[PDB]
RNA sequence: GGCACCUCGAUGUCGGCUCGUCGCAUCCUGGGGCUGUAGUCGGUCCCAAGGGUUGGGCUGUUCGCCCAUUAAAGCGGCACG
RNA sequence: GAUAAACGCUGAAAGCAUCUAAGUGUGAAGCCCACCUCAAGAUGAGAUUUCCCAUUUCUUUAAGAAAGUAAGACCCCUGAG
């Protein structure tokens, strides 16, 4: 995980998804991309 | 479950079968009549009243001799209860000899501590004195009472007040002998109480 | 001095009512109840005589909490010792000790003196579905309030 | 809802009733009972079914999808049932079963077991494959998860448990 | 007196506003003190007034 | 550091002693995600305040340097308690 | 037993993917039980077993006043576990 205030997709495959009162970023290709806004 | 009261005689030693001295105290006992059976449908729980010693007759009153005589005994001195015991299995006026603790080997004695009167704030908490020389004048006192901001004294600041006289239990002690012909148990270790006090022994709680 | 009706002690007659709590938010049920208890709705109101009624609350488990407050309205207490702040409960008391709920959410909305205490022991709250007080023939209230 | 507007083509041997919200589905093996939202207009016509519903769902489009997907799940489950196949690498790993026990030897000191509820069984071909079969999709999935949860793979040599078609990246870490 | 008019009146389906409003509309001008006294004692008369007021703002 | 509202019919400073207590922006133990993580070690970030957190040499000392241990030798508030 | 970070299962709005809105789980020295003690002045003053059962005038018959007792308790004396 990378937990940052600002969150951006870094690959082309990355997607922006809300799961709870939070904002994920999931990328099946690489794992270094899981970003969760906090 | 397995519960017995009794006196407290003292302490001596005993060799085991392998040449090893063992400190041992002498919990004495006598037979003792179950006095009343408290049930769910009547008293909200399940328990058993017992009593370990014999009064004279001058030293009781009609309530006591009317509350005992439903089991036909001389009026007793102590009366206690027990819980978590498999009730069943019992009757009004039975007995509980020392048999129940053959080599139970795990047991939790309780009792009442000694008594030590008004005591300082060092014999009760292990608080340390202040420098007894180098010109000081703070030998044997209880320290400060806290900070300034709150304009009061917090709860649970500890200082002088009667020491000892409240019950306490020890856990996981063994048993060494059961001399049914004289009703005496022998356990390992130190047990609390003054001589001739009242003691109770039940099976372990921590399995 | 002139003529205005001032209720005496015993001339006031109290009644008995039974109120349900099936799917009602905590606040409003408590509000109606608290208004009934203090003696209002009786034109014989007097602000130092205890002209109240007797309330009996049923089904205190099925009371409704809107939105969250199922897991957020955190009650509290303090034991007057250092670090004693025990926030133990939540909106879980609906399950257990459901009497505690209304017996605070109303023992708040009353005054804070003796009158406001002897005016509280007329409460009887039951999480269950039937009361033992048929000895006194209580009636029913409705709620479009 | 393009997912809440497909067909429910019942197979052979299918009984479907309605008692309250409870729409049970029975057939050759299935006797399942689920719940369904109170805004669902079921259909008719032996084996040709759809789901008309009074729309304006949560956001005009939500409940439809889950509801029709779940009913199609019911149907497919009662008809045949499902599978989840597992492999095993990590030289020295085996698995043996006698009914509702699955011992596992995957390198720990002591062999790990696994119980089983009723609606599921295990069909062990050899020491390197397992196959779960059952009725529900959820339960099959959960048990397969719990089983993989004992030792998921490792991206260096390839040990651990995998699904069959599951992919695992390999970080070619040097040897010292 | 206001709280007492509240209690009594509300029983007749007249909120403690609409009663006063209708009364000051049908041109009836009783003083609150007398209204409180009536509400406590002469229930028949109070109900008569409440009826007239109900009629009044009904127009 | 700034201002000068507060106390001049008197509101006593630093360290050390006895005694604690609270916050977490966490030092150890506990649960986790990523790695330029083969293993043993590690780096960073996240959840977490339950308990624990050493003896001595030198200066009035806070501060600090050093010796010897340890799971670790935390940072701060409470009239710089 | 219920949860935190994290990990899922099943599933759509978005014919796919996707832990979530409906459904359904795992998960920490931390939360609540488990262990030890105090505790009905808990004026919402709890429960159980046993014991003791009736004079005089009238204030006026009322939750009246007064006197002698039962069960028991205390005073006084020998002491200390
Ligand atoms: Zn990416």
PDB file of C-alpha atoms and ligand atoms in Angstrom, chain A residues 10-14 26-27 29-30 33, ligand 1:
ATOM      1  CA  UNK A  10      -0.016   5.238 -12.350  1.00  0.00           C
ATOM      2  CA  UNK A  11      -0.481   2.481 -14.939  1.00  0.00           C
ATOM      3  CA  UNK A  12      -2.999   2.260 -17.739  1.00  0.00           C
ATOM      4  CA  UNK A  13      -4.662  -0.767 -16.164  1.00  0.00           C
ATOM      5  CA  UNK A  14      -5.093   0.850 -12.744  1.00  0.00           C
ATOM      6  CA  UNK A  26      -6.135  -1.329  -7.790  1.00  0.00           C
ATOM      7  CA  UNK A  27      -3.793  -2.646 -10.479  1.00  0.00           C
ATOM      8  CA  UNK A  29      -0.422  -5.958 -13.285  1.00  0.00           C
ATOM      9  CA  UNK A  30       1.958  -4.613 -10.704  1.00  0.00           C
ATOM     10  CA  UNK A  33       0.282   0.503  -7.137  1.00  0.00           C
TER      11      UNK A  33
HETATM   12 ZN1  LIG H   1      -0.745   0.169 -12.495  1.00  0.00          ZN
END
